[PDB]
Amino acid sequence: LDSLTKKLSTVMYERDAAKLVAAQLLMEKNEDSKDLPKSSQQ
Amino acid sequence: MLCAISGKVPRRPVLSPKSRTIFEKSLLEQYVKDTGNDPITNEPLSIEEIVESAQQASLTESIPNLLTSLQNEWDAIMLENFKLRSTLDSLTKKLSTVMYERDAAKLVAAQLLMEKNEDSKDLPKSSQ
Amino acid sequence: MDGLSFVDKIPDGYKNEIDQLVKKEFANIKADNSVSTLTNALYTEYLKQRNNKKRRTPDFNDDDDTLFLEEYRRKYPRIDTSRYIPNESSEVSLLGIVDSYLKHQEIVLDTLLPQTVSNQWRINNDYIRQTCTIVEEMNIQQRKQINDLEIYRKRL
Amino acid sequence: MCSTLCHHSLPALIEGQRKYYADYYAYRQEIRSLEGRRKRLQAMLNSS
């Protein structure tokens, strides 16, 4: 019971931790688009 | 002050010399005969390896010991372990939802790691 | 793997956003004897086995059956009255002696609550410094990144 | 939570080097474009 709860806890923590990687990554990827688009335009 | 098997408050506690942990004699003596090793550390341990007062105030209304008290004890044992079996089943199901969602996130990161650096690379190339 | 918790001061919308992207990638992937049998059946059915509801009621001028039931009530009442005598002899001394044991048992738990509290805050304390170390280094990197970005333009 | 923060420490501490080392190499490439673009400007004075 408790030995599985350790796996549950470590996962959920690391999941939402890994989830924040995406939030960061997505906004930087987005920044690269408008930058290049507005530059390639002119 | 407690036993490290049942969750008791032992009447004859005995400590093992391989892993310092106090168990109630009956429960540790049973484990060694089942499989001769220490339950916690999984180290070699025998009955001879082991090394050997509590007051409960019997209630004022102490018939009930045969009928009411004994009934409650086997109710409380029954409905707890059943509910504990229910808890173990959900932890394994909620495990599967954890690992799947984790691996789902891994694929996003891997997909976005190719995306970002190539978008950055394109800005470096744009200058030329 | 890397996502700075202490340094990234990350809205609820971003959790809701990232949850949807994680959700879309989940759309894609999709030892005892007879004792155990009766115990599991008792818990599942939600019914405890009935005990002897007999000693309490009984009835006078019964028969040979109530002659037994009567004689049961006597011996247990004498055992009862003897079982109340040895309790009252000690009285409250036996009770308060066990009350003291319970206070020794309680304080031990709350000592472990502190030991865990300290080491848990101690681990987080080490993480904090790491977060602030790198967060600066990332800040340094981005500043240099933006410098090139405009530098390369102004050359061309 | 102790075992959480214990684990969080060990997986995070490794991720940082990888985070930095990526940006470090990302920076190295950016420096090269900076390092060359100057030279073309420098060669404007040679023609004069």
Swiss-Prot record, chain B:
Residues 1-62 form the U-box domain. Residues 63-120 are annotated as: Interaction with CEF1. It comes from the Eukaryota. Residues 54-128 are annotated as: Required for self-association. Present with 11700 molecules/cell in log phase SD medium. Belongs to the WD repeat PRP19 family. Homotetramer. Component of the NTC complex (or PRP19-associated complex), composed of at least CEF1, CLF1, ISY1, NTC20, SNT309, SYF1, SYF2, and PRP19. Probable ubiquitin-protein ligase involved in pre-mRNA splicing. Acts as a central component of the NTC complex (or PRP19-associated complex) that associates to the spliceosome to mediate conformational rearrangement or to stabilize the structure of the spliceosome after U4 snRNA dissociation, which leads to spliceosome maturation. It is also probably involved in DNA repair. This is Pre-mRNA-processing factor 19. The chain holds residues 1 to 142 of 503 of the full protein.
Curated annotation (Swiss-Prot), chain C:
Keywords: mRNA processing, mRNA splicing, Nucleus, Spliceosome. It comes from the Eukaryota. It is found in: Nucleus. The keyword Nucleus applies. One of its GO terms (cellular component) is Prp19 complex. One of its GO terms (biological process) is mRNA splicing, via spliceosome. Belongs to the NTC complex (or PRP19-associated complex), composed of at least CEF1, CLF1, ISY1, NTC20, SNT309, SYF1, SYF2, and PRP19. Involved in pre-mRNA splicing by stabilizing the NTC (or PRP19-associated complex). As a component of the NTC complex, associates to the spliceosome to mediate conformational rearrangement or to stabilize the structure of the spliceosome after U4 snRNA dissociation, which leads to spliceosome maturation. Present with 721 molecules/cell in log phase SD medium. This is Pre-mRNA-splicing factor SNT309. It comes from Saccharomyces cerevisiae (strain ATCC 204508 / S288c). The lineage of its organism: Eukaryota, Fungi, Dikarya, Ascomycota, Saccharomycotina.
From Swiss-Prot, chain D:
It is found in: Cytoplasm; Nucleus. Belongs to the CEF1 family. Belongs to the NTC complex (or PRP19-associated complex), composed of at least CEF1, CLF1, ISY1, NTC20, SNT309, SYF1, SYF2, and PRP19. Involved in pre-mRNA splicing and cell cycle control. Required for the binding of the NTC complex (or PRP19-associated complex) components to the spliceosome to mediate conformational rearrangement or to stabilize the structure of the spliceosome after U4 snRNA dissociation, which leads to spliceosome maturation. Its absence leads to an arrest of the cell cycle, possibly due to the inefficient splicing of TUB1. Present with 784 molecules/cell in log phase SD medium. This is Pre-mRNA-splicing factor CEF1. It comes from Saccharomyces cerevisiae (strain ATCC 204508 / S288c). The gene is CEF1. The chain holds residues 540 to 587 of 590 of the full protein.
